[PDB]
Amino acid sequence: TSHEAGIVCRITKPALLVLNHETAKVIQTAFQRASYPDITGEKAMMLLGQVKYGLHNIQISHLSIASSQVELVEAKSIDVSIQDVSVVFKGTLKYGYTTAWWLGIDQSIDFEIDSAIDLQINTQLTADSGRVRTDAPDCYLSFHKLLLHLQGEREPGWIKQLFTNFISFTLKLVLKGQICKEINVISNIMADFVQTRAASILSDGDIGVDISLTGDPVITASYLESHHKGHFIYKDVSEDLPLPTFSPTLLGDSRMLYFWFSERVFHSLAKVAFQDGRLMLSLMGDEFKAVLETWGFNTNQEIFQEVVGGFPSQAQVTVHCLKMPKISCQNKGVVVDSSVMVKFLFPRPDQQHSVAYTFEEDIVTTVQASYSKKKLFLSLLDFQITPKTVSNLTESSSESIQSFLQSMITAVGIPEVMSRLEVVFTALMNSKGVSLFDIINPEIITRDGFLLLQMDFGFPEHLLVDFLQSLS
Ligand SMILES: CCCCC/C=C/C/C=C\CCCCCCCC(=O)OC[C@H](COP(=O)([O-])OCC[N+](C)(C)C)OC(=O)CCCCCCC/C=C\C/C=C/CCCCC
Ligand SMILES: *[C@@H]1O[C@H](CO[C@@H]2O[C@@H](C)[C@@H](O)[C@@H](O)[C@@H]2O)[C@@H](O[C@@H]2O[C@H](CO)[C@@H](O[C@H]3O[C@H](CO)[C@@H](O)[C@H](O)[C@@H]3O)[C@H](O)[C@H]2NC(C)=O)[C@H](O)[C@H]1NC(C)=O
Ligand SMILES: CCCCCCCC/C=C\CCCCCCCC(=O)O[C@H]1CC[C@@]2(C)C(=CC[C@H]3[C@@H]4CC[C@H]([C@H](C)CCCC(C)C)[C@@]4(C)CC[C@@H]32)C1
Ligand SMILES: CCOC(=O)N1c2ccc(C(F)(F)F)cc2[C@@H](N(Cc2cc(C(F)(F)F)cc(C(F)(F)F)c2)C(=O)OC)C[C@H]1CC
Ligand SMILES: [Cl-]
Numbered sequence: 001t002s003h004e005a006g007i008v009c010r011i012t013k014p015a016l017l018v019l020n021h022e023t024a025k026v027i028q029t030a031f032q033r034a035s036y037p038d039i040t041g042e043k044a045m046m047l048l049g050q051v052k053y054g055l056h057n058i059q060i061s062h063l064s065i066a067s068s069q070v071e072l073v074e075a076k077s078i079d080v081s082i083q084d085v086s087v088v089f090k091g092t093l094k095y096g097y098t099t100a101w102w103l104g105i106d107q108s109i110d111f112e113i114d115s116a117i118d119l120q121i122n123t124q125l126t127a128d129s130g131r132v133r134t135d136a137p138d139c140y141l142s143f144h145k146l147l148l149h150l151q152g153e154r155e156p157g158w159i160k161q162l163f164t165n166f167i168s169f170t171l172k173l174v175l176k177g178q179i180c181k182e183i184n185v186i187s188n189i190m191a192d193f194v195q196t197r198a199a200s201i202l203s204d205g206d207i208g209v210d211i212s213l214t215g216d217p218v219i220t221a222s223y224l225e226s227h228h229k230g231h232f233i234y235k236d237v238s239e240d241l242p243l244p245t246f247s248p249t250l251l252g253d254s255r256m257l258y259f260w261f262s263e264r265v266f267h268s269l270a271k272v273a274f275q276d277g278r279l280m281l282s283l284m285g286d287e288f289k290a291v292l293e294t295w296g297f298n299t300n301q302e303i304f305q306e307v308v309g310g311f312p313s314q315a316q317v318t319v320h321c322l323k324m325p326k327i328s329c330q331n332k333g334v335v336v337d338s339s340v341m342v343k344f345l346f347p348r349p350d351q352q353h354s355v356a357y358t359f360e361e362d363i364v365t366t367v368q369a370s371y372s373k374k375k376l377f378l379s380l381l382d383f384q385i386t387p388k389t390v391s392n393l394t395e396s397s398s399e400s401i402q403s404f405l406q407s408m409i410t411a412v413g414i415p416e417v418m419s420r421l422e423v424v425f426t427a428l429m430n431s432k433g434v435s436l437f438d439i440i441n442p443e444i445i446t447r448d449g450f451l452l453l454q455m456d457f458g459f460p461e462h463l464l465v466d467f468l469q470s471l472s
Contacts, residue, residue, distance in 0.1 A: 001248060002245060002246070002247060002248075003214065003215065003227045003245070003246045003248070004214050004227070004242075004243035004244070004245060004246070005214045005227035005228055005229070005230065005243055005244070005246050005260075005262070006228065006229055006230020006231065006243055006244060006261075006262045006264055006265050006268075007209075007211065007227075007228040007229075007230040007259070007260065007261055007262070007265060008225065008226070008227050008228070008246050008251070008258075008259070008260035008261075009225065009226045009228070009257075009258075009259055009260075010223050010224070010225045010251050010253075010257070010258035010259070010260075011223065011224040011225075011256070011257060012222060012223040012224075012253050012254070012255065012256055012257070012258070013072060013221075013222055013223065013253070014254070014255070014256050014456075015256035015257060015457070016070045016072070016078070016224075017070070018256065018457070018458075018459050019070075019459060020068055020069070020070045020080075021459075022459065022461075022464055023065075023068040023070070023080060023082065024065035024068060024082075025464060025465065025468060026183075026186055026187075026190075026468070027065055027068070027082055027085065027119070027183070028063050028065065029186055029468050029471070030179055030182040030183045030186055031060055031063055031085075031087065031179060031182070032060065032063070033182045033185070033186065033471070033472075034175075034178035034179055034181075034182050035178065036058035036059075036089070036174060036175075036178065037058075037174065038054055038055060038056045038057075038058070039054070039055040039058075039167060039170060039171060039174070040053065040054040040055070041053055041054075041166070042098065043162065043166070044099075045157075045158040045162070046157075046158070046161075047157075048097060048099075048100055048103075048156075048157075048158055049097070049098065049099030049100050050097075050098035050099040050100075051095055051096070051097060051098065051158055051162075052095060052096050052098050053093065053094070053095040053162070054093070054094045054095070055091055055092075055093055055111070055167070056091055056092045056093075056094060057090075057091045057092055058089055058090075058091045058113075059089065059090050059091065060087065060088070060089055060090075061088045061089065061090040061112065062086065062087070062088035063085070063086070063087055063088075064084075064085070064086040065082055065084070065085045065086075066083050066084035066085070066086070067082075067083050067084070068080060068081065068082045068083070069081045069083075072219060072220065072221045072222070072223070072224070073122070073219065073221070074219060074220055074221045075219060075220075076122075076124070076219060077122040077123055077124045077125075077138070077219065078122070078123045078125070078219065078224070079120070079121075079122045079123075080119075080120070080121045080122075080123070081118075081119070081120055082118065082119040082120075082121075083118050084116055084117075084118065084144070085116070085117045085118070085119060086115075086116055087113075087114075087115045087116075087117060088112060088113070088114055088115075089112065089113040089115070090110070090111070090112055090113075091110070091111055091113075092108055092109070092110055092111070093107075093108070093109045093110075093111050093150060093159075094106070094107065094108050094109075095107050109150050109151050109152075109154060110150075110151045111148055111149060111150045111151065112148075112149045113146070113147070113148055113149075113171070114145060114146075114147045114149065115143060115144075115145055115146045115147075115175075116143070116144035116145045117141055117142065117143055117144065117175075118141070118142040118143075118144065119139075119140065119141060119142075119179075120138070120139070120140040120142075121136050121138075121139050121140075121180075121183055122136060122138040122139070123135070123136045123187060124136070124137075125216065125217040125219065125224070126216050126217075127213040127215060127216045127217070130212035130213055131191075131192070131195055131212075131213065132191055132195065132213065132217055132226060133188060133191065134184070134187040134188050134190075134191050135184065136180065136183060136184050136187060139176070139179075139180035139183060139184075141172070141175065141176045141179070143172055146168055146171070146172065148160070148163045189471070193467065195211075197433075198211060199211055200432055201429070201432045201434065204428060205276075206234055206235045206276060207232065207233075207234060207272050207273070207276060208232070208233040208234075209230060209231070209232055209233065209265070210228075210229045210230065210231040210232070210233055210238050211228040211229065211230070212228065212229045213226060213227065213228060213229075214227045214228065214229060214243065215227055218248075222253040223253050225248070227246060229243065230243075230261070230262060230264070230265045230268070231268065232265075232268040232269060232271070232272050234272045234275065234276070244262040244264055244449070246260060246262075250447075250450070250452070251452070252454065255454045255455060255456055256455065256456045256457055257453075257454070257455045257456075257457060258452070258453070258454050259452065259453035259454075260450060260452055261450055261451045261452070261453075262449065262450055263327065263328055263329040263449050263450060263451070266327040266328075266329065266334065266451070267326070267327055269327070270324055270325040270326070270327050270336075271324050273325075274321055274323070274324040274325065275324075279320065279321040279325070279338075280318070280319060280320040280321070281318070281319045281320075281417065281420070282316075282317070282318045282319075283316070283317045283318075284315075284316060285311075285312060285313035285314055285315055285316075286312075286313060288312075288315050288316070288317055289308075289312050289313075289315070291412060291416055292304070292308070292408075292412060294416070295411065295412045295415055295416065297412075299312075303404065307346055307355055307401060307404060308346060309346050309355075310346055310347065310348040310349075310353070310354070311346075311347065311348075314346075314347050315345070315346050315347075316343075316344070316345040316346075316347075317342070317343065317344055317345075318341075318342075318343045319340055319341065319342050319343075319413065319417070320340070320341050321338055321339065321340060321341075322339045322340065322341050322360065323339045325337065325338040326338075329446050329447060329448065329449055329450050329451050330366070330446060330447075330448060331446065331447055331448055332366055332381060332382075332446070333366045333367050333368045333381050333446050334366070334367045334368075334369065334446055334451065335364065335365075335366050335367075336364070336365050336367060337362065337363075337364045338362070338363050338364075338365075339360075339361075339362050339388075340359075340360075340361060340362075340363055341358065341359070341360050342358075342359040342361070342405075342409050342413065343357075343358050343359075344356065344357045344358075344359075344405055348396075352394065352395065352396070353394075353396050354394055354396060355392075355394065355396045355397070355401060356392065356393035356394050356396075357390065357391065357392055357393070357397070357401070357402070357405050358389075358390070358391045358393065359387060359390050359405065359406065359409060360387075360388045360389040360390070360391075361385060361386060361387040361388055361390075361409075362385075362386050362388060363383065363384070363385050363414070364383060364384045364385075365380060365382075365383045365414065365418075366380070366381040366382045366383070367379070367380060367381065367418070368380075368381055368444075368446070369444040369446075370444060371439065371442045371444065372442075374426075374430070374435040375422070375426050376422050376425045376426045376429070377422060378418045378421060378422045379418075380414065380415075380418060383410075383414060385406075385409070385410055387406065390402055390406075436460060436463060437457055437458070437459075437460060438457060438458030438460065439455055439456075439457055440455065440456035440457060440458060441455070441456055442454070442455040443455070
């Protein structure tokens with residue numbers, strides 16, 4: 001099989017195995033969210049006549065899930081089995097001897113219902129209006145025990161039988177009907193939340209990415225897989241341009257999470273970043289002097305003194321992209337070809353002596369990315385600089401000046417821009433909470449036409465507990 005998408009997400013069986021340690025927390029929440037209506041009636045009891053009854057204020061007093069197991073059913077669903085969910089309900093039994101009025105006043109007995117259940121939830125994943133929706137219509141319950149215990153162990157003779165016959169049955173059906181409904185709601189609440197957080201991560205101000213599905217998610221016995229548009233949105237405008245082709249053969253099934261990114265995404269990124277006016281840098285006096293030092297060169301050297309030079313607190317440097325950067329995914333790395341305008345101004349007392357140069361050039365950099373210790377790291381594999389139009393805006397100019405300014409662009413400009421770049425993406429991910437998760441041995445892999453993120457993750461316990469508590 002083959003798929004049309006700009007971005008692809010693959011969650012494998014090892015990821016589901018780690019997430020299965022939290023299934024009980026979700027199932028517990030489902031029981032805790034359900035609304036059990038009162039069970040009332042009036043039947044003629046053996047030798048007693050009409051007895052009007054009611055099981056009121058049914059609340060859970062104890063819950064315990066023994067173990068859960070998850071299985072991927074190819075082309076069908078995600079099958080979760082929950083064994084031995086020990087439930088204890090409490091409430092009030094209220095009755096009256098309608099016909100046998102001689103038997104005294106109406107009663108109110110506090111009871112406990114001790115039940116053991118085995119569950120089977122088979123969740124189907126579908127594309128609903130761009131987003132993944134979850135539907136579990138195959139939700140099953142198997143009861144191991146369903147015992148009533150009344151305060152003081154009271155028994156007139158009609159209670160146990162009315163509970164064994166009649167009541168037992170309806171209660172089993174009320175429970176399944178509520179529990180399954182709640183599992184489906186919590187399940188969709190999670191899906192919705194995960195997708196909202198994923199869309200938040202892939203956005204900054206007027207820039208966002210359209211992660212709308214291209215088809216229903218894929219279920220194999222090895223993995224779960226979802227295919228996304230990946231079209232960039234700018235100021236609430238997007239274009240439904242034909243999608244690249246994804247091959248499920250390109251991805252593995254060993255790591256917990258595999259992310260596929262077409263190079264069109266990086267191209268579409270560069271376009272919006274350029275148009276939003278983000279691709280510019282400006283350095284003033286002190287900041288400019290600090291940058292030169294930061295790149296292993298002492299400020300009070302001779303070289304500096306002749307040109308940077310007149311007044312260090314008055315020196316200006318501006319870099320802006322002339323046109324949109326051309327990004328390409330290669331086996332060797334991410335290759336970025338950017339047409340830049342570097343402007344240098346070193347004002348002197350008399351505006352004649354000031355050195356004013358404008359370097360209009362094309363810089364090609366081959367980058368390699370890394371993530372570790374909750375930071376993004378960009379390293380330079382190779383580069384090429386071709387000056388298109390170097391210009392001097394004063395009589396204060398020579399070839400040695402042009403060389404010092406050009407060496408500055410190469411030896412300081414390239415490492416600093418990459419340094420600032422890594423900081424920005426690190427801040428974005430941090431602010432969007434990517435650092436909250438424990439990302440284990442991640443690998444950024446560049447290939448011809450695409451990039452690949454392969455990772456194992458440590459699911460953070462308390463954050464789910466927090467989210468689960470935050471419902472109504
Ligand atoms: C764009 C990548 C290509 C970069 C290569 C460009 C070639 C170099 C060309 C010219 C050099 C001059 C400009 C470089 C210097 C500026 C570098 C920089 O400092 O910053 C890059 C810039 C934001 O500069 P600024 O003036 O707005 O802020 C300034 C920050 N200060 C307030 C602290 C001062 O532009 C951005 O970063 C744009 C990125 C925004 C991304 C947000 C969209 C959401 C998508 C992904 C992010 C989430 C991570 C998941 C990954 C999914 C894969 C897409
Ligand atoms: C930019 O700098 C030019 C000179 O600097 C250097 O020029 C190259 C040789 C090279 O080393 C390069 O790296 C540097 O940029 C300035 O050009 C000079 O301007 C002078 C004044 O106009 C000029 O002089 C005389 O030129 C003719 C012929 O001799 C006379 O008829 C005239 O009256 C001038 O007195 C000099 O020759 C000229 N040099 C060149 C190579 O053109 C240039 O003006 C300056 N730009 C700005 C905007 O000021
Ligand atoms: C004294 C100084 C004065 C002189 C004036 C200065 C003159 C300078 C002029 C020009 C300099 C221009 C040269 C620099 C060119 C830019 C080079 C340059 O660094 O370009 C890079 C920009 C970032 C990026 C798009 C890239 C490649 C890899 C991308 C990344 C791959 C994965 C990354 C995910 C966010 C991480 C997922 C991790 C997961 C949680 C496990 C992702 C998408 C982040 C962004 C990069 C190329
Ligand atoms: C940290 C917040 O983000 C996330 O947790 N993820 C994320 C991140 C990037 C992208 C990507 F690739 F498009 F850029 C998509 C997604 C999410 N996602 C896909 C997805 C896949 C399945 C799958 F495989 F099982 F079918 C199920 C679900 C969900 F939400 F229903 F549970 C979501 C997404 O946002 O889809 C629109 C899934 C999730 C994977 C860690
Ligand atoms: Cl009694």
